[PDB]
């Protein structure tokens, strides 16, 4: 399937989403959106796009979408999506960018909506002009399950563990440099105090 | 089991001899973490939990969990002289022995994890030439999808946190480094200016 190793992040930012769940109350949450593009393990010629909706506050919350260069004609059909596969992530980004920048008094107002109906969920980005609500994109996401959330958290962990390692390396290098500057400052202060004595010389 | 009020008593990699049914024997370095706390349901019930994981296989997990109550069965089915409070200490010293063991040693302390599928047995053995004498033998359950999920979410928030702290120190360190360079440059300026004031004043007084 999809190899999160050879993957490329195109977008990875929190977006203000209106989450609507089945027997729970409507809530405005800030959810993380990551748009990934790569290939299939089985066939290195099959391009795939992956989208993840997660929360930094709920580490178990996850919603996923996955479409190959092939199956894109199915998704494109029924939706009316004018754009091709290569163009698709760009259409998604600009729309999520509009939602990010939306301000209270706005009209037309761009709003992201995630409707959770048990084992399936629908993500839409809508343009709200007073009464009328016009959708720019409507997508089909699958929530959970235990096996998928498990793999995601293992990916996230190795990822954070890695950026942690890099931070540690810079801190070492920075601390080493700071220590060298103090030695140089002390030597300069010594030269300065010695020159002052050499000034007397009376 | 309260993971909020929990306490880590041990947390280190130990060299373990992993034996699996249908696979070849392997010497791996596995992470051991010993925690003690209480039950969510009853704040009066003391519990001990031990996790065996790998930094190389993020899905590998084997767990052991015993409450102050359940200890007596574990104690009888073993001959363990020590009480519940004393038990983690017995485990630690044995894990230290395995950690410090060197190749040519005899008596040599060795950690062994046997996987039969659905169940796994962890033992710490003393090897004096031929004879192998076990000091501890424990029953571990390999983690399922739901248990591995919770573990990785715990690990992630934990690393995400120590990552934040590292970032803060790097900011503070970088700020200090930048200030030292400014101080060094100012000192070098003062030094060059004094030199001109000296040179001139000595030429002038002639």
Author numbering:
A (entry chain B): 15 to 216
B (entry chain A): 16 to 221
Question: What did the published study say regarding this structure?
Answer:
Here, we demonstrate that the centriolar protein SAS-6 forms rod-shaped homodimers that interact through their N-terminal domains to form oligomers. Proteins of the SAS-6 family comprise an N-terminal domain with the evolutionarily conserved PISA motif, followed by a segment with a predicted coiled coil and a less-conserved C-terminal region predicted to be disordered. Furthermore and in conclusion, because these residues are well conserved among SAS-6 orthologs, we propose that the self-assembly of SAS-6 homodimers into a 9-fold symmetric ring structure is a fundamental property at the root of the universal 9-fold symmetry of centrioles.
To investigate the structural organization of the Bld12p N-terminal domains in the context of the two-stranded parallel coiled coil, we produced a fragment in which the crN variant was extended by the first six heptad repeats of the Bld12p coiled coil (crN-6HR). AUC experiments conducted at 150 μM protein concentration revealed that crN-6HR forms higher-order oligomeric species. However, a mutant in which F145 was substituted for glutamate (crN-6HR[F145E]) formed only dimers, as revealed by AUC and MALS experiments. We solved the structure of Bld12p crN-6HR[F145E] to 3.0 Å resolution by X-ray crystallography. The asymmetric unit of the crystal revealed a dimer (denoted the crCC-dimer hereafter). Dimerization is brought about by interactions between the two α3 helices, which establish a parallel, two-stranded coiled coil through knobs-into-hole packing of the residues occupying the heptad a and d core positions. The relative orientation of the two N-terminal domains is maintained by predominantly hydrophobic interactions formed between residues of their β3-β4 loops and residues from both coiled-coil α3 helices. Having the structures of both the crN-dimer and the crCC-dimer of Bld12p allowed us to build a structural model of higher-order oligomers using both dimer interfaces. Strikingly, when crCC-dimers were associated such that their N-terminal domains interact as observed in the crN-dimer, we obtained a ring with a 9-fold symmetry (see Experimental Procedures for full description of the modeling). In this structural model, the long axes of the coiled-coil domains are in plane with and radiate out from the ring, which is ∼3.5 × 5 nm in thickness and ∼23 nm in mean diameter.
